[PDB]
Amino acid sequence: SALRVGTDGIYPPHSFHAQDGRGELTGFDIDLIKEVAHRLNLKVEFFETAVSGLITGLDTNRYDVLVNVAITPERQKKYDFSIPYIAHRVLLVVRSDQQDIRSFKDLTDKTVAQILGTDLSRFAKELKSHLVFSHNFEQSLQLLLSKRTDATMIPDIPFFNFLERRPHDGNLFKIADRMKDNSAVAFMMRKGNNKLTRSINEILCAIHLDGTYKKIFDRYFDKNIISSVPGCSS
Amino acid sequence: SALRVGTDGIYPPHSFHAQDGRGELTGFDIDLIKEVAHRLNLKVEFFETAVSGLITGLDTNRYDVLVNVAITPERQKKYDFSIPYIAHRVLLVVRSDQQDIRSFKDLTDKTVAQILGTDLSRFAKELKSHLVFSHNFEQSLQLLLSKRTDATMIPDIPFFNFLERRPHDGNLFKIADRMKDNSAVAFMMRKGNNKLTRSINEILCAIHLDGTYKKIFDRYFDKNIISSVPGCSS
């Protein structure tokens, strides 16, 4: 049978369409979950969904696995997680011209672009920022660059990818703050799907061991910049 | 109810007895699982067994949790694992004046000290080394000094704790090689009770988030040498 995966195909380098949106789904998490399914002897069925609906989609059983999910204690309480397969660091990104934002606590009463439905949007709302909801990271940085927002909280992976895809933009950005720790990212499943979870975990250990992980990782990321997760053991 | 934990208390800094081996059980993994247990409102019971029988006691229900277990494909097939909470890196350690051993493949036809019942012992046996079975990492280094053996494969965490405890012996040893990747380490449990695994994973994320992990880690390790696992997200 198929492996049903929910994702949003406008999040380079995680999940995005080739040939400038016209081609097949690709990206780091897409390749990785397809490799897990190949080794599981499974076809992958991708259900493209907006981020605001990814977790509700999982709840609704429209699909079985979500990619690139940050582990939180409330998500672990409510869902099953694979072993982490990557980590990101959350950054406070501002224009290089900004003067009054030097920390996360400074975002109170500032205008902040965050993706509707995300924990980062909730955090911005807890900070009593004024939210401008974006539909992906690209728009978040577009809103900042156009001066419609003062800042955005974004993980390092999509931000650095943005700088790679357009280095003229950027150099126009600066990182005002960053979380003290990086953040484990894993595949998220319905609670109780213990057998799929174990299978994914064993396949990911294999992928680490025979070098397939590093191959997928290096395809998309700068090792000197993006944090990976511990290897496995024979 | 009680959280029953199996360990062998002769492995500083993981699991060892205070007061030069005469007082209460202490250590990084010991402190961590106790903080996990307290936060789950469970009392903790420890049981000490030689390493070669730790997994047997798990299989036969004499205890529920093993600490400081390296994740392997075979183990993930047969047991449940918590999320990784530390990572070690396997070193090839020889005497400082040793000349004929530059890689793991050089261990064929050499004498090596390893702990019976461990994967490193099995690796040593598969390389066609000549095994001398030590009773812990401390003895493995002593066997190396006495020239009963010409090498020992040991993870970085206890090797560097030994350097911290006996700096003036450090000139007697050198690292001849090391694994290209580090290795995720987790709490290991019998297959089946997903509930306890999820609860441990949740509390370990909370331990990361409030600074407790860093506190326990820093009590025992040098962040400049020992690798950590990713943080969590709120």
Helix-strand blueprint:
Two copies of one chain form a homodimer.
Chain A: E1 2-7, E2 10-11, E3 15-17, H1 18-21, E4 25-26, H2 28-39, E5 43-48, H3 51-59, E6 65-70, H4 73-78, E7 79-81, E8 86-88, E9 90-95, E10 111-115, H5 119-126, E11 130-134, H6 137-145, E12 151-155, H7 156-165, E13 173-178, E14 183-190, H8 194-209, H9 212-220
Helix pairs in contact in A: 2-8
PDB class: transport protein
Keywords: Candidatus Liberibacter asiaticus, transport protein
Assembly: dimeric
Spell out the key features of this protein:
homodimer; 234 residues; alpha+beta; D-Maltodextrin-Binding Protein, domain 2; 6-stranded mixed beta sheet; 14 strands; transport protein; Solute Binding; dimeric; Putative amino acid-binding periplasmic ABC transporter protein
